[model samples]
Target chain A: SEEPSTVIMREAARHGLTIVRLQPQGSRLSLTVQPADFQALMAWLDALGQAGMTTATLAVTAVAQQPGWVTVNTLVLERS
Target chain B: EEPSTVIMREAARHGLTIVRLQPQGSRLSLTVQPADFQALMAWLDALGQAGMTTATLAVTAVAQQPGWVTVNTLVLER
Candidate 1:
């Protein structure tokens, strides 16, 4: 069922779920989940999608960095 | 005079009066001159020079995290 993710995840985690990894990649976030709680996470993500919140994870390798950061550029696209 | 950002480059630089630079392909943000913001954006010359199509920015990060845990913040200053 497509719904707004304003609950489900919170409930599942409250029941005792462990998060493996989470990172906000631009506006869309990237998360690595294990069997312990993959269903819940994916469920919420799907809800978000139905709510018009899309996520995409590009295969990018960071090769450099600047000390004085100065810009907020994000790449958020529909993920299927 | 400005245009809708429906089609923008992924890592291309935007030449607003603020002058945004994509030192990296990662997500980075910066607010140069708030006043001249619209003006600067008007000067954006998408990476037609780099040869790429437009892209969309969505907010699906927290959405994926059903449990919603952990905090990561990115501070940009360019």
Candidate 2:
């Protein structure tokens, strides 16, 4: 069997971003970004200049919102 | 709150059927249904055709149901 390495990076309230998770999912990579820094995150992603990959799906966990915060989560899938 | 109109439009443009899941008190989820398992893979293939080479499935909640692998929330990355 081939060994598949997986890594997860998490952070809280960094640059207006509350939480960010990066992990490897099989043949693709998954990133979760809090809505607080969604726009900036997207811009940085776009700056990756394709990276031999394309955006698969941009789905939110659920339609959740909170006062002084947003319960919405952003998930970005990348595939080569 | 961001209006779902844009997102729904994009999903429609890709011919993907989606179900919006939102429970009370700050919770939400989304489900994309293809015709079946095969169809879903085909859909992923189509994404590859467009230059996507990876897939991600984020599951939030799950439960055992009579005959359903019931999922409370899901997010598909890329």
Candidate 3:
């Protein structure tokens, strides 16, 4: 069996939105987005731009699903 | 609490199918049914009916929002 790894990076050619899952990270509350949905998420990030967020880094978890539905969860940070 | 609380009793509800959230009373469990979904957000207790959000947040702090999915996380008795 392959050893489990934490923290991954990805990129895409064009812009489009996709779904991702995120579970709570360490005590710091960091989240890692599922790799499969990274491209789509980058699209949304580009679309939403500053309006979408104020935080630079976020984390998320992805769970395998049956088909027909895509769900996305967002965690907003309050700017002081 | 009632006397007759079994997985069978919940799944047997008319037009309703409940998912027992916990063990058969070993630890604890919440229950849900098809009829308790959006467009059908009624917990439908034998005594009365409850809303979907109520059902989700009734026990824990977990709130059902877009993309925020959670399994029952329960284990039934053998």
Candidate 4:
């Protein structure tokens, strides 16, 4: 729990989650995550929101689906 | 020209790489470069004249790669 950014990164790595962290746009760490495509986007956002991070927009597209597996590609999250 | 994939070709034509392309039916959204705003919008404008049109746009600043800048959505029409 050193910092939100570091904590989130470490947490993601431990959980096999992938996040692409970017430069600070006005002191905010804006990053991208491909959780479960759209399938996992909502659920991931709930977890992230619980982490005190501000939720942004989503890629808003539906990818190919296979039974219970689907995709919701890019998303924005800001750690304040 | 297939309005959808041609956008990919047009991007390569500009020497720009598209980060991610999300195709929704006749509509499309993609993550692209910071400096590519004008060129892409212009491309879409011409595409509109050719019967395709731009839809939504959102910007997300991302990491070290030269990729990941804006999320632009465009649509194709008959």
Candidate 5:
């Protein structure tokens, strides 16, 4: 089996999510992601679930309109 | 304290489950669980009253967990 962090990074990339921060701890993972539609977010979550990651928590930590684009600070995801 | 943050904290206080949170137009769309319909609407009422905001709810379905319901809420600035 691959490192969970490696697998998670690959999964996020597979979903085309712009990862802002990532921390993989024992039996848990915490991360922040940039603006992405709900569709992509759900897909990533399902993918994580399919790969054995259970969601511990999810929330919108922050948001901002960066001139022309929205830089949604992060929709935090913690997996157990 | 931030209104939305307070609202989120309140949801936890009541054991509400937040499935997803996304921005739609001028609002934040939240898919949550354990309907607690009354308490949730109450949360919105109090939350909106505290901010320049408005809210709406649409009960979708009952969660697989008995007694829990799926609810969608729109929270936005008024």
Candidate 6:
């Protein structure tokens, strides 16, 4: 199908990346993951990195008042 | 909020522009002007030159088709 959401989730699972929230908007998609999956996610990104994909931009937000949490990492990537 | 549209509205108010938006009971199809669309495409072209055929984007904005740009916001929280 090449549905962004479908591909994202499928590849994520295959790579052991756990997603907390996955939302796709036509040409764009977004997802949330628990900090626990950070490493695997990075590995996933690394694989893409090896394929010549890199982060176009990145942002991190902290969940204030949410205990034991420091930050949420959001990396924006495009094919190149 | 419980509804994403609501959240999206707020985002648009803050300068996020949206090109199109569709919702099929929560599954959404959306498009936007990349803050630097040309630059973004150029990067994608490099990837294509490298033989990678697909990609995923993160949407992180809201708007009423207000305008265009070169970068689209895709929200990814961890």
What are the per-model numbers of colliding residue pairs? 14, 11, 11, 4, 0, 18
Model 5: residues with Cα > 4 Å off, grouped in runs:
A25-27, A61-80, B1-78
lDDT tens string, model 3, B1-78? 332354345445534444545534432345543232211211122212211111112111124332122333222222
Cα lDDT, model 3, residue A61: 32
Give the lDDT of residue A69 in candidate 5.
24
Task: List residue ranges in candidate 3 displaced over 4 A.
Answer: A1-80, B1-11, B15-28, B31-40, B45-78
- Order candidates by lDDT, high to low: 5, 4, 6, 2, 1, 3
Model 2 CA lDDT for position A58 = 42
Instruction: Note the Cα lDDT for every prediction shown.
Output: 0.31, 0.37, 0.29, 0.49, 0.53, 0.43
Question: DockQ for all models, in order?
Answer: 0.04, 0.04, 0.02, 0.03, 0.07, 0.03
TM-score leader: 5
lDDT of 5 by residue, A1-80 (tens): 55667767888888887877787645456677776544455567667766655444443222343211223332333343
Error of 2 at B27 (Å): 18
Residue B62 error, candidate 5, Å: 17
**Candidate 3 lDDT, A34-55, residue by residue in tens:** 2434325434443333232222
Q: Which prediction has more favorable TM-score, 2 or 3?
A: 2
Q: Supply candidate 4's per-residue lDDT for A28.
A: 54
For each candidate, give its TM-score against the true structure. 0.24, 0.31, 0.20, 0.38, 0.44, 0.33
Task: Indicate the docking level reached by candidate 2.
Answer: incorrect
Name the runs in model 2 displaced over 4 angstroms.
A1-19, A61-74, B1-78
Give the per-residue lDDT digits (tens) of candidate 4, residues A30-59.
Answer: 555553322243344445656666444434
* CAPRI verdict (incorrect, acceptable, medium, high) for model 6: incorrect
For model 2, residues B1-78, the per-residue Cα lDDT tens digits are 132443355456556677763433322245765322223333434433443321223322112211111222343222
Error of 1 at B58 (Å): 20
Task: Compose the digit string of candidate 6's lDDT tens values, residues A1-80.
Answer: 24445555666777776678866424444556655333344456555544444444434332444322324466454433
Q: For all the models shown, what interface RMSD does each have?
A: 13.6, 13.1, 15.1, 10.9, 10.4, 12.7
- After aligning candidate 5 to the native by TM-score, how far in Å is the CA of A58 from where it should be? 0.7
lDDT of 4 by residue, B2-72 (tens): 65567777677655567777777866666665544334434544554565444444434345422234444
User: Worst 10-residue stretch by lDDT in candidate 1 chain A?
Assistant: A66-75
RMSD from true fold, candidate 2: 11.6
| Model 6 bad stretches (over 4 Å) | A48-54, A60-71, B1-78
